[PDB]
Design a binder for this molecule. Sequence first.
Ligand code: NA
Ligand code: NA
Ligand code: NA
Ligand code: NA
Ligand code: NA
Ligand code: NA
Lengths: 533, 533, 533
Amino acid sequence: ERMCGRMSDFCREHKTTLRYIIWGILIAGYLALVIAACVMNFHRALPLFVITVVAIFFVVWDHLMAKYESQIARFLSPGQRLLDSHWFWLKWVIWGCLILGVILWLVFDTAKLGQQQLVSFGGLIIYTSLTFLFSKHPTKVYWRPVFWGIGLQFLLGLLILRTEPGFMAFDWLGKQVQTFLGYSDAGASFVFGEKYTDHFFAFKVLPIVIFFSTVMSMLYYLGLMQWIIRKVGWVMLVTMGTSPVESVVASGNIFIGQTESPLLVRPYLPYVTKSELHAIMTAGFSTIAGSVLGAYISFGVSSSHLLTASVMSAPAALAISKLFWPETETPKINLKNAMKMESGDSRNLLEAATQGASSSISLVANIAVNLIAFLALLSFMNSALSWLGNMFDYPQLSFEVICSYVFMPFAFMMGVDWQDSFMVAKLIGYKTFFNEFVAYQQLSKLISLRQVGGPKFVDGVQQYMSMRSEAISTYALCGFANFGSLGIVIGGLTSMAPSRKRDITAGAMRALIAGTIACFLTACIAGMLTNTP
Amino acid sequence: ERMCGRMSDFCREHKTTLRYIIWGILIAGYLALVIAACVMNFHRALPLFVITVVAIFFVVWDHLMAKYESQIARFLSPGQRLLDSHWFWLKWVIWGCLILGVILWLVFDTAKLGQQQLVSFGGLIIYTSLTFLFSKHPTKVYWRPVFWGIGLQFLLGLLILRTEPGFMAFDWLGKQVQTFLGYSDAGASFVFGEKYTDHFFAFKVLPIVIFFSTVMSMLYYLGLMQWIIRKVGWVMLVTMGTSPVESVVASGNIFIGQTESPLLVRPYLPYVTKSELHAIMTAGFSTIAGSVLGAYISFGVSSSHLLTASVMSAPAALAISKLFWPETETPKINLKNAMKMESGDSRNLLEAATQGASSSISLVANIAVNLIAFLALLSFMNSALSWLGNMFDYPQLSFEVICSYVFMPFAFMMGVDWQDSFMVAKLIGYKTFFNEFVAYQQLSKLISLRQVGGPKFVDGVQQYMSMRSEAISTYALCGFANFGSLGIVIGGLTSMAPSRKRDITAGAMRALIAGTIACFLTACIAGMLTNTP
Amino acid sequence: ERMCGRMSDFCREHKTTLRYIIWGILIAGYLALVIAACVMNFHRALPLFVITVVAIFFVVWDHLMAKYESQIARFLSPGQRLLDSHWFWLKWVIWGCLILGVILWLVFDTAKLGQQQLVSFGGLIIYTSLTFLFSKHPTKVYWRPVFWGIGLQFLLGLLILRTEPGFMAFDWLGKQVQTFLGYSDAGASFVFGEKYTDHFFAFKVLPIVIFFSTVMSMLYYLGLMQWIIRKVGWVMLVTMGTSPVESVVASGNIFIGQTESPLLVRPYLPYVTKSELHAIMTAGFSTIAGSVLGAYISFGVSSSHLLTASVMSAPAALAISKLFWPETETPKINLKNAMKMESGDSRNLLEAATQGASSSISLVANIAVNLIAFLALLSFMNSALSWLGNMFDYPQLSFEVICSYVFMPFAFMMGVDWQDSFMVAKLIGYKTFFNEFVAYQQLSKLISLRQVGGPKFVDGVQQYMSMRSEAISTYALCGFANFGSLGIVIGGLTSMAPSRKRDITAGAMRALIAGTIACFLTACIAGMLTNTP
Ligand code: NA
Ligand code: NA
Ligand code: NA
Ligand code: NA
Ligand code: NA
Ligand code: NA
């Protein structure tokens, strides 16, 4: 077997050059396809060219930053020193300019829009003040992250809701997701037949969850998700001054569920502080996961609003966490350790697809059973309350009626008008007591009723509300914060870090309340930027 | 933050009074609602008043018993001493009076009813005698629990089946359950659509199981179930002289499944005797769980009979266990340890609801798969037996035909007439070899056929049987005793107590046989008290 | 209790004779039934008589072999010594006779059949040569198992495909399975109603899997499966000279899945060599399980071909494993240890049925979810490729089109004609990238189209292929070898033997490739023996 030994020696001697040459050939082939497509027709091949250009730009950028980091830092150092020298007097100028800009924006846009937008701004202030007053350590508050998070939310809102470029970008992004969720029908039609639409939720909506989980697992294998997470976390870390671990988890929670996002920093969990743990749980509670987005879109909820709320929730979560539970210890973990995310044990892409599919079994099972139980309990509670109410000649008593009054002030402060605040309060109650699936289903009912065009009042009962109120409700309801998920959150986090069971239990309720407040802050900003139609 | 420190000091100083005052205010509000409801209209508000009155009575009673236990015991002591002094001669008088009462009841009621009721009494005697003859320790039998359990069963039967108050109470109780199981349709209609009735069992019956498990978990969180269990267990403990642990488990098994009832005494399992372990498994085998009651009611089985059998099974289970495997050791566990039931790890009611829902996934999955497998095996076995029978010009050979002859004597001794005994034997076979779901389905078929009113015989084949036989079959079939559940019982009990694996395996088969005998004793009593229509 | 003591003493004294007498009485009863059935009518009772005769023959045979093993070995020893003495010159004569027979068979049958059969033979040679060239240890090859496995495959093919007795036997065997899979409808119709056919796959096909798993568990309890396994493994061990452990696992994999077949030798796994581990994984990858056979038959795939391929796969798997990874160590485990198969923990048959049913839950769940995900991914990939292809005026680009060219040479070497090779390549791609369920579904589509009789070409697109190509595809696709099952195989095998994790990972990919090659060798033989219609 002399030839085999020669082949093995040749392979060993120049292993690095052989695989690099192969990869170069593949890249050259892809570029040849792109250039030929552009040559044959450019307008038809434009999106492929755009994708290739942006990918090349990002690759070159990352290589340069990795290679020339020291030189760039040294080059930037002098300006930082000069700014540090003049900051003692320049801080007042910068702060005054920012305050003046806020006042001008209010006077010349928010007042023009109407009273409800000003009420949204007031509600923003009031929620922040209530967070401060009931803070764990009111005297230890570091105010930089709070203002920076609120400012980042405002800037994202201006970019996406008040500019044609961002509005178009996110409408397009939402439309792509709607196209993407239709591919699951191919599998649903085989497994459950051409009559799979006879059972819409079970045989059409849950397969969307399965498919989305599969795709997310594939993307995690390929390493794209970690790349986006690192970028967003770096932005939040450099502006708000938050710790690397909580920034990474907050950025990750945009795409990943509360129970799986801490796995990004699993090794370092035992050494995190109390504040970072609170921030982790709050970020978990203030966001949703990319596996359940398609279901909410299938109900009829706006995709663009869901994506915008998911993006805006992270800085809100971090600001509210730092205000509610500020840092009184010294963090141990550093940036390099936090940013490295131990990938899963998948040898190839198809194994990642199978692992993503298998994990989705319990998710859909629990979703279905929880919905069954919650809706049966709702029916029983309404029947019991009607039974009790009839003893006072008020058989209309219901869970919805009580929630329409209990939660109305929260909706009013978010900028919802007087009439529609009572309807939004019912959705808040549904989310608080059962979950966000039920609330989004009811919101989809209201949206469909509005879209039909029927009467707005029948026998004195309002049937549907305005579109602005629907957007505000979409922002308010985007989260996994409910009283029933406290146990699963605590259990999973203890499983990852058994030593910290005592600390985890202490901060969980405060974290849930903070997540709710963060969703309401996102809703307040959306309300103050949207106009009355 | 001086105000916050003042608030914290105020909260700490008078924590006990603050929460007590809050609870008092809530109670006052509830009482105000009740009294106002009665004032506006009394006949309409009667049930609420009754519920409030009984709750108040039980609260006051428990407080008094807890506070004045020593004084009451001291007050009762003299009479116990006097009775002990005169018992050597008074025991004969009491026993003779009881025997005379039994003879009179037989002569003046059972003989009047007919021959079948006397046969039911004879079958009671015969089953007890067979239990004694094949006993583990025939010379170590303590006869007090045996007679006390049979007497308690007879008294419950007289109260519920032979008095208007008890008959009405349990008919009302059964009717409430039927109303309760209808609430699951709200969730089933959403998850599975308005066509969920196209698949009746899977999309309408199993959701009932899910909902009932959820409600049972909520009740276990609230502590009501343990309260009822403690009351019933105390009655059985004080009359039959049984050990606290087995009394608690027997009372618990009325509501809870065999695999979960031992968790009530999980810490103390390693130290129980062989007899107590046998009693635990027997109680597990002689009863059903509150999660699967609604399914049997949905089939068409009488709710009142199911509840009555579930209540009557516990003293029967304990009597048969003590007769089959009497106690030859010294029990270690005491009343206080047995009565304390470590509650689950649920922080609030909604978490208990979610935990109850999640646990139901495996239950319904196993139910469905087991039914599929058992019914396919039944079809294959019947086809094979027809194939074999045709070789003797008897292609009618079947599992049902063989069981109609094998188990007929057991049904005859329970008081079923000659014609219907062969039909009841088939149900006994179904329960023995596959499970009680299959048997109750077949019984529901027979009940529906009777209710239609069609011919009782077609081509010489009896189509349905009498109502008394249906009741007797309902009592006989109420249990989880089948050859296939021995493994899961043993596995779970070893998991709770690994050290006792050797003892658990030894007594499991005897426990299964005892459970079957207990169900047959309940059926014998029901037969001797019911009349022929 | 003197009588009970006397009974216990009587039972203890003559325990062996009592149970032997009882078993003898049962046997006498069975024989009486058989003889009476024959007396009443013989032609009607023939199959029962045949079954009884073969069972008696095998029982007597096994008893004699167990009792007289030493005498038979001593009696055979002289002839073995004489053959060993004359072998140095007799080996050339035997080898020349075999080569001459092969040449004659080719010339007088394969050439008569046509060119495609000769191409099948050439493909057999080419696959073997490629296996040798890329072997782990090309200089350490032991050639006896390779030739013996290929010869055993050829002999089985001649017996089953080219003789009336074997063809009839396996057609009958296939027809019995079709009858057997119909019994699951009884359970499916109850659990899912009379409309269970509205959802064919989920409510009719998976119940077949459940039922088959139940039956396999029952047979494993009874010990029949181990008996057949031992016979086949002994044949392969004595002819091919393979190690006992790998022979037992290869024979077991005919009936049992890859993830459960190693449990037959679980205790001895830590001490197996690298080659035996590779052979175990290869045997796992080259076969299917008896639980999923009914689903493929339900699609419309030939039962006889599936059974024949499953039988032929084992010697192919062992030959390809020994050629790809030959043995360079000393095996430790012996025949007695390998042949003993620790049975499961089931106390009775019905417990085995319940355990078989419960295990099937995860199997069907994973099957369904994996199919959903794979088919949605296929739709997305096809849409993306059409989007890319339209940039070159080729919107017909698809996964099927690419696979029709990538895998065509493999199909051509198996003897598929030029036109149908492109269609078989698509099935090979489906199996390689997703799994064998998808591939068999597509093959069933093609078979149904052929059976209808419509046009073979519409608008220049071939709709269906010949029957010989369908058989070749049936043989090629019979295996669990796909890139996504590597992880589950590795995980389970590490779980059974944690110490060997390093060795398991090394050989898994080579094992998967070997399994694919083994399926292709079975297909090559089938192609060279089948005729063109
Ligand atoms: Na999240
Ligand atoms: Na949010
Ligand atoms: Na029970
Ligand atoms: Na019972
Ligand atoms: Na296999
Ligand atoms: Na194969």
